[PDB]
């Protein structure tokens, strides 16, 4: 249980967490 996600799955969470991360760099360093 809880391990059908992937090893991509951190990943995703990754080019994920920066891509927004961007959308926010966008409102904190501009």
Do not use: D, E, P, Q
Not at 5 to 23: D, M
């Amino acid at each position: 249980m809880a391990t059908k996600h992937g090893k991509n799955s951190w990943k995703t969470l990754y080019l994920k967490i920066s891509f927004l991360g961007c959308k926010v760099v966008a409102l904190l360093k501009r």
